[PDB]
């Protein structure tokens, strides 16, 4: 019936943004409310945030 | 590279109580670099006058 079929393959990267549900392994769910700039990050004596 | 300049400031005033400064525009963490700054400075780095000692007498 359909002698010629053309299946297209698109490609779309979907990144990480505020609103995506993320969790862990030990059963700790959650949703990122607002991915903030590394400038608001609490750092230790070292400086590494 | 292109930088931006702070402008438009709403001096919302009520006699001697409070003034509320509304400045636009700011960027990723500029409302912080500005706000936090004024706070600590207005607390332990601002000259002013006040009573230090009060000897009644007796």
UniProtKB/Swiss-Prot annotation, chain A:
It comes from the Bacteria. The RNAP catalytic core consists of 2 alpha, 1 beta, 1 beta' and 1 omega subunit. When a sigma factor is associated with the core the holoenzyme is formed, which can initiate transcription. Belongs to the RNA polymerase beta chain family. DNA-dependent RNA polymerase catalyzes the transcription of DNA into RNA using the four ribonucleoside triphosphates as substrates. This is DNA-directed RNA polymerase subunit beta. It comes from Escherichia coli O45:K1 (strain S88 / ExPEC). The lineage of its organism: Bacteria, Pseudomonadati, Pseudomonadota, Gammaproteobacteria, Enterobacterales. The chain holds residues 1045 to 1093 of 1342 of the full protein.
UniProtKB/Swiss-Prot annotation, chain B:
The N-terminal domain is essential for RNAP assembly and basal transcription, whereas the C-terminal domain is involved in interaction with transcriptional regulators and with upstream promoter elements. Homodimer. The RNAP catalytic core consists of 2 alpha, 1 beta, 1 beta' and 1 omega subunit. When a sigma factor is associated with the core the holoenzyme is formed, which can initiate transcription. Belongs to the RNA polymerase alpha chain family. DNA-dependent RNA polymerase catalyzes the transcription of DNA into RNA using the four ribonucleoside triphosphates as substrates. This is DNA-directed RNA polymerase subunit alpha. The chain holds residues 6 to 63 of 329 of the full protein.
């Amino acid at each position: 019936g359909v002698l010629k079929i053309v299946k297209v393959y698109l490609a779309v990267k979907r990144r990480i943004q505020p609103g995506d549900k993320m969790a862990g392994r030990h059963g700790n769910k959650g949703v990122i409310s607002k991915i903030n700039p590394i400038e608001d990050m609490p750092y230790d004596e070292n400086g590494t945030p | 590279t292109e930088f931006l300049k702070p402008r438009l400031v709403d001096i919302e005033q009520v006699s001697s109580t409070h003034a509320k400064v509304t400045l636009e525009p700011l960027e990723r963490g500029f409302g912080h670099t500005l706000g936090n700054a004024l706070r600590r400075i207005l607390l332990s780095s601002m000259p002013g006058c006040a009573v230090t000692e009060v000897e009644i007498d007796g």
